[PDB]
Symmetry: D3
């Protein structure tokens, strides 16, 4: 049976001037800008590396256009260290998303800036 | 003992072209742009009026600069229909925030565009 | 647009003879008896100061007559340190409530004794 | 190995004058007043029969003196229809408790009036 | 009114060769094999003694034949240290179950091997 | 940067003789036996197709040997319709797992029979 592609990205979070900075690294340790092109059905797995000392945990992935069909589903691990996106790459187009995280310093949710997902169907 | 100000805003959510649109209304039914100036300690209470048929519920309020001290705390009701912000208005400045909501159509979180809170301390 | 009043009360919890004692303090540090008169629409914000070493967290606010309309809604912060009441002060009358808290020593919920809210509509 | 006693009580909840009324029934269908004497180690199982149309669910059992040792633990089912108390009946004495329930009409927790548990150790 | 039997079993969990081993002990400290015969209506209370250093907590009790009527309900404590089974012992027969636990080392759930419950109605 | 393989399996659940039966189908609609061989790093995405009318939802994936390193992580969607496994395929070997699901008919968790994951590292 046919298998898609699994992409793996680390979401490193540091503090600069007291506020979070999101740095994505790829499977080669390279800092990457964060946008992703999806060229066939598959998954995107994000691992949190929280270096802020603010107790960050993922609570989900947010979208200003959540019904656009670019991302089919979001899954989250029980410890808030992993989120995975399912992208079946049938609907062509682009969508902006932001990571949503809790923190242990206060009761505000933390939002990343928004990368883009770009779907290029087969 | 001294009492602050309680502001009340309705967060109306409709769908246009299949995607959510956030319309804030004030205590007089007037559509307001959404930014808020806080001029003394108090609270901001947001009531959800979901007209999307997508089962929206608040899950919190997100911030790209969550440690800036403009908003002290966020509280949420058990039904996801209300969120309240505590703003003690000691730290002057401005912050951008986005509502974070779940929906019953898919597993993506929904983000509003970002209003600003502006603190003007006494 | 019209703004209500925001009241702020600290819920200090100590142990005496091994059991919790609830002491409310107002915005001037004064110990207050705990009952509140509401004279216009607004909010009541309760901040937990747990000095018991029993890991108390708010889980909500309970009522023996929960459908009486005196309190419209309860919101809670993710860390269990804040609860807020919405009181629109349309329904005149009085209601008794008790704080409900979890603790880390055992699996029993902790209840405060019951203050009263008294609504005096405009 | 030695076995304790398992008691079973139904917590029937009706509305009278728009507000909840708690009626306990025993294993013979008899209305009982609600206080329980425990004369050896065992469990007390409470089954909710909600006839209010307000969507009641147990969320726990609350105590004003939660560290008194009369009740050792509370367990709850995932549907909120059952709560069980563990009473090892080593500590003699009495304690007052109140059921704590959520409802689907509003975000206030519902509290029962308080029965007593009376421990008479072997 | 008629009272059933309350059975109490400790679920001791150790690590051998890096993996969990479940050892049940009865009310006399005796290691028992784990299967239980139920001869009248009652409850079975399982207390977790986690000696693995892996932060185990019960999250429930699982069944491959969950609709067979042998066990009527499962309740769980808020700290994950206790699970209780309600067995009304009307339906005669046997069922296999496995404890389900979370752990703090990873995001996989932990399953015990399966004991049997055997119902012998009165 | 290097990309792994994403496998997609549907977990169809029917009732036969009142009890759940798990039928896995692959990306071609073929019924498959359920065991999976993993030959490089990647993900396994399981979509629930519940045809039981018992309101099944995934709550996680359980393991009798959860620290064996074959599966690195489990993620779950908010609606309980998807679970995903991360398998980095560094640790060679095999592990047995069972799906864990809640249901709306009773408070017992539902367990599948156990497929195997077999890791063959590159």
């Amino acid at each position: 049976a046919p298998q898609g592609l699994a992409q793996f990205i680390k979401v490193n979070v540091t503090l600069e001037n007291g506020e979070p900075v999101f740095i994505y690294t790829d499977a080669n340790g390279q800092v990457c800008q964060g946008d992703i092109t999806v060229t066939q059905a598959g998954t995107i797995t994000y691992l949190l590396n929280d270096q802020t000392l603010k107790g960050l945990k993922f609570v989900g992935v947010g979208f200003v256009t959540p019904f656009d069909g670019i991302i089919d589903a979001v899954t989250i691990s029980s410890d808030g260290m992993l989120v995975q996106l399912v992208d079946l790459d049938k609907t062509p187009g682009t969508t902006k998303f932001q990571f949503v995280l809790s923190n242990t310093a206060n009761t505000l949710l933390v939002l990343s800036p928004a990368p883009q997902i770009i779907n290029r169907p087969q």
